[PDB]
Design a protein around this ligand. Structure first.
Ligand SMILES: O=c1[nH]cc(O)c(=O)[nH]1
Ligand SMILES: O=c1[nH]cc(O)c(=O)[nH]1
Length: 222
């Protein structure tokens, strides 16, 4: 892993080295079968290329975007290029503006969040192109479970923003008093109107962080 991911993340993910390699073998066999995978191989583990020690907020999404160009190995982010935004990201940008009173971002690229210690983790790290949540139950779950347990274990505060019923089952792994869960319905249009709008997770996370003696997150995107 030492060559695929930042130093901290390589040590934290050591336990699932076997399983990362194994999911290597899965991507090879998908290309061989004529089904492909998003994101690019070089961006699958991309959420782990920013420092493990600097992570203070965990945003758990479920799967990479099914549309080529959307998925870039950071949950909810799209390529600077891409327009229009998937309605998921639009709904996240709605709430950002409502919560922080910033105007809408000029592109869909969330790397600045990654740079400031937001871990944009999908529970599953690949997807069959144009087929949503299609790589569930293949072996990613144990890899992203290992990442989360290792964040929760650190001598350091953590806010977990958990979007959707599925993301709420990760609460057991965050019971350690240094971790705090914010739960709401997923920003996907199917569920956005059931709780996500008005949920104020960006401002609440920073309140949480400051209460724990952590530096808050500059959420502002250009
Ligand atoms: O990266 C993501 N894209 C779209 C989603 O719905 C999600 O949960 N995660
Ligand atoms: O609409 C808004 N205006 C100003 C704010 O601070 C805010 O959080 N939301």
């Amino acid at each position: 892993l030492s060559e695929l991911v930042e130093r901290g993340w390589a040590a934290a993910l050591e336990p699932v080295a076997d399983q990362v390699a194994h999911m290597g073998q899965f991507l090879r066999a998908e290309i061989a079968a004529g089904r492909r995978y998003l994101p690019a191989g070089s961006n699958v583990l991309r959420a782990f290329t920013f420092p493990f020690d600097n992570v203070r907020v965990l945003i758990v999404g479920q799967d990479p975007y099914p549309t080529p160009g959307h998925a870039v190995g950071l949950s909810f982010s799209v390529a600077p290029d891409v327009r229009p935004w998937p309605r998921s990201l639009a709904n996240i940008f709605d709430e950002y503006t409502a919560d922080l009173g910033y105007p809408l971002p000029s592109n869909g690229d969330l790397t600045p969040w990654a740079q400031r210690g937001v871990l944009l983790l999908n529970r599953v790290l690949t997807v069959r192109p144009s087929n949503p949540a299609s790589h569930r139950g293949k072996g990613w779950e144990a890899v992203t479970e290992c990442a989360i347990r290792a964040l929760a274990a650190r001598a350091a505060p953590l806010v977990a923003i958990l979007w959707g019923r599925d993301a709420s089952t990760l609460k057991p792994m965050l019971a350690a008093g240094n971790c705090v869960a914010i739960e709401s319905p997923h920003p996907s249009p199917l569920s956005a109107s059931r709780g996500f709008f008005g949920s104020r997770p960006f401002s609440r996370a920073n309140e949480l962080l400051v209460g724990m003696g952590a530096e808050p997150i500059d959420w502002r995107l250009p």
